[PDB]
Amino acid sequence: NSLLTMFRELGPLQIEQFERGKTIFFPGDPAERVYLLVKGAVKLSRVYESGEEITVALLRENSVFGVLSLLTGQRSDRFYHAVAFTPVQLFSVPIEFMQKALIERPELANVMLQGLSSRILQTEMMIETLAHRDMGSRLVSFLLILCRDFGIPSPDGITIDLKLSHQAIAEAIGSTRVTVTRLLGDLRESKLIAIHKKRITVFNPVALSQQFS
Amino acid sequence: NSLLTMFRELPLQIEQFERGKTIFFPGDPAERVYLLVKGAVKLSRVYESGEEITVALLRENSVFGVLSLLTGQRSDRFYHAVAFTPVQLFSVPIEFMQKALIERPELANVMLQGLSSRILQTEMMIETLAHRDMGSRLVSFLLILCRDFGIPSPDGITIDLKLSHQAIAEAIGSTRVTVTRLLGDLRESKLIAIHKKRITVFNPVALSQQFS
């Protein structure tokens, strides 16, 4: 919105490309900077001794993140794993620059607070979907969020502009891949979605959304 | 920490809320921002059926009513904020915040830290909710409460909260019946004790590693 305008100051800041799959920060990296994602989808996650990961966030275009750095800076380290879930473009300021920025250009402070406020709300939406007791509805709820966060109008309805694997979904809705496959199958044979080259299209979100609630 | 100092400007009076009394309802305009000073506030989502699902258990010193920073009165509340314990808080109308932040920048940073902190806490909740078996969903949840509302006691750490089986079920996305069974198991296994609705976990550092 205007976060873009804000972040593009603070130097002329250069964009950063991240190829799909490439990690933006690792657990253990010092929380020394703040990020505005400009294009693409970033996936925050928690990584276990086993090597398995659990998805804590799918950040969407225009999301501020790396927020821990506003608490701590170097003081403490990252404990989540930020990864380019699609090809990604972002800005990235070292935190101390932010302070000095906000001090002098207050206008940004408000915009910043709105950014974070918006994130609190989106996380809570995720809690809500995760709170569903049956997986069928956990899934549909999750898809509906993606429909709004990454949706693109298409002839058959709304298409989730994301390469979603069954495993990525499983790690998002706290499920096994096998169960995601079965559920996605059921949705398809019920003429509610279609998947083409890993992109899901939901035909009638407003319907699906009311069909469950 | 210092949010307290910040909010106490704007001389603002505290507000008491009796346990169970609602702080805002779905449909109330997002007219103001809140700092909870003492007690526990429960944000939830309310369904046609009347049933509710817990989205947050806010903890002493949490900023909340955050939607008002996006929209002000222009859009309405869609969550239900309720005093889960007796509560004391401050409550500024948003436009007063803007003017505050404009003039006392120092607060802006402090504010951003408050919201940052909230993003992280919510993500912790996502994590517990992500556990595939309820046993571990429960334990993970209890461990959060141990840190958010824990008080040292002789037998270990006591969660300073009146937690019913139904409140728990609404927090970890479970049926009441299952919460009763799970809590039973935890007790018969000498891992927690519950008195007069307060849960005490004997060895959090152990329980926390016992599962991970």
Ligand SMILES: O=C(O)CCC(=O)C(=O)O
């Ligand atoms: O939610 C986020 O912004 C990512 C978590 C985080 O801020 C961090 O690890 O520093």
Ligand SMILES: O=C(O)CCC(=O)C(=O)O
């Ligand atoms: O996360 C919060 O602060 C409560 C959600 C909120 O601000 C609202 O529903 O207006």
Ligand SMILES: [Hg+2]
């Ligand atoms: Hg949508």
Ligand SMILES: [Hg+2]
């Ligand atoms: Hg603890």
